[PDB]
Amino acid sequence: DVYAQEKQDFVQHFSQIVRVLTEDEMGHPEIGDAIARLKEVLEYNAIGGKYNRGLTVVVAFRELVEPRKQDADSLQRAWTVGWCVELLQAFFLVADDIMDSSLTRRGQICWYQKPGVGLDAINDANLLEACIYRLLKLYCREQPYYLNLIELFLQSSYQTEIGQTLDLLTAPQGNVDLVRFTEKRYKSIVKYKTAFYSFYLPIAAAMYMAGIDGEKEHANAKKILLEMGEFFQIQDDYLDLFGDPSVTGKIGTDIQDNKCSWLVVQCLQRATPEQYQILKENYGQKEAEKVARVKALYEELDLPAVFLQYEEDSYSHIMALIEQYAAPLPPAVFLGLARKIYK
């Protein structure tokens, strides 16, 4: 993996990301305590994922820029903008975990659940967002793509927040209503909440850093990447339930949490009224036998089969989209991602 390789240089750079964000203690003694706190927030919430989103910025930059324009300072900025994507994701996660009342994240006590943090985690999350724009000013203010990157991050923020709204309206935890759980609505949530920031944002960042600022180029890439994003989340939802937990790295609570998961959406498109009721009974309760009872119903409606067929059709559709819309980017940009997620 072009990823496996650059992962070292990416995580080492984090040390510097922090040094700089905390350098204004030398500036202003007054605010030191606050900066100490900011250090703690970064160290706890930005480390511990697989850094797929961040690395994608660096990998795409290497693939998009003639090697002659890849000097030490250019790579410094690719590293930094990748970290900016991870910090956006960290901001969303800290805040999503408060709102969902989640207990663990990346197999670790969620930040807001730590002794002496609680709802202070809201300000903490706001700082994480701020840090994106601090890094962009510190590393990219002199660059011709500076404004392009600010607009991208801000738009990405807005698209995600919109998705979060739509989700919260659709799945009030403590309110088992399946009538709002439709394909149209599932697709929209994924597009706004996950797909823009996870697939479009990091590639679009690399494109601007490479002098590829054209609206048609970005539209074309967007068409490919939002569809990759759709498949990714659908696979996320399949494997929450049917995923081997030692393989995935997690055990799925989507059923207990009354999620608008691809699985229930398909289940509802297929059920007879008898079956609608068994689900209406069991979907969104914590009881292990009322959760075995949905899994069994999913199984009896051969949804693992429905998924395998969707995974085949989806693979064909992505490859056609890459043929049509990749040019004049190296198809490798897209193919590298398509291989991480169809793995």
Ligand X SMILES: Cc1ccc(-c2cc3c(N[C@H](Cc4ccccc4)P(=O)(O)O)ncnc3s2)cc1Cl
The reply to whether 89 sits in an annotated binding site is yes
CA–CA separation, 177 and 56 (whole Å) = 38
Nearer to a second copy, 27 or 107 (CB): 27
55 binds a second copy (CB under 8 A): no
* Cα 215 → chain centroid: 23
Q: Is 250 annotated as a binding residue?
A: yes
Q: Which does 326 bind (CB under 5 to 8 A by kind): a second copy, ligand X, none?
A: none
The stretch near ligand X (CB under 6 A) out of 212-220, 245-253, 262-270, 293-301 is: 245-253
C-alpha closest to that of 232 among 127, 333, 136, 339: 339
Distance (Å, rounded) from C-alpha 46 to C-alpha 54?
Answer: 11
Catalytic site positions: 50, 91, 96, 100, 105, 167, 193, 232, 236-237
Q: What gap in Å lies between CA 204 and CA 149, rounded to an integer?
A: 9
Q: Please, which of residues 75-134 interact with a second copy by CB under 8 A?
A: 95, 98-99, 101, 116, 119-120, 122-123, 125-127, 130, 133-134
Stretch that binds ligand X, among 39-47, 112-120, 139-147, 335-343 (CB under 6 A): 335-343
Q: How far is the CB of 192 from a second copy (least distance, A)?
A: 7
**Is the Cβ of residue 97 or residue 178 nearer to ligand X in the bound state?**
97
Min separation Cβ 37 and a second copy, Å? 5
| Residue 165 engages a second copy in binding (rule: CB under 8 A) | yes
Alpha carbons 278 and 101: distance in angstroms, whole number: 27
- For tokens 């203010």, the residue is 141
Query: Distance between terminal CA atoms of the chain?
Result: 12
- Is 100 annotated in a binding site? The answer is yes
Looking at beta carbons only, is 150 or 319 nearer to ligand X?
319
H/E stretch holding 188 reads helix 183-190
Query: Of the candidates 147, 7, 151, 20, which has an alpha carbon nearest to the alpha carbon of residue 82?
Result: 7
User: Is 38 a binder of a second copy (CB under 8 A)?
Assistant: yes
Query: Measured on CA atoms in the order 233, 239, 240, 244, is the torsion positive or negative?
Result: negative
105 marked as part of a ligand binding site: yes
Give yes or no for residue 331 binding ligand X (CB under 6 A): no
Eight-state DSSP code of residue 1: -
State the binding partner of 339 from ligand X, a second copy, none, CB within 5 to 8 A by kind. Answer: ligand X
Give one word for 271, left, alpha or beta, with left for phi > 0 and alpha for psi -120 to 50: beta
Report the C-alpha gap between 89 and 12 in whole angstroms: 19
CA distance 196 to 189: 11
The response to whether 266 counts as a known ligand-binding position is no
* Residues contacting a second copy: total by CB under 8 A: 43
**What is the DSSP secondary structure assignment for residue 195, as one 8-state letter?**
I
Return the number of other C-beta atoms located less than 10 Å from residue 304's C-beta. 13
- Three-class DSSP category at 109: strand
In the list a second copy, ligand X, none, the entry touching 341 (Cβ below 5 to 8 angstroms by class) is ligand X
Q: How far apart are CA 132 and CA 88, in angstroms?
A: 7
Using the rule CB under 6 A, is 245 a contact of ligand X? no
Binding residues for isopentenyl diphosphate: 50, 53, 89, 106
- What is the contact surface with ligand X in residues (CB under 6 A)? 49-50, 52-53, 56, 106, 198-199, 236, 239, 248-250, 311-312, 315, 335, 337-343
Binding stretches for a second copy (CB under 8 A): 30-31, 33-34, 37-38, 95, 98-99, 101, 116, 119-120, 122-123, 125-127, 130, 133-134, 137, 146-147, 150-151, 154, 157-158, 161-166, 168-169, 172, 184, 187-188, 191-192
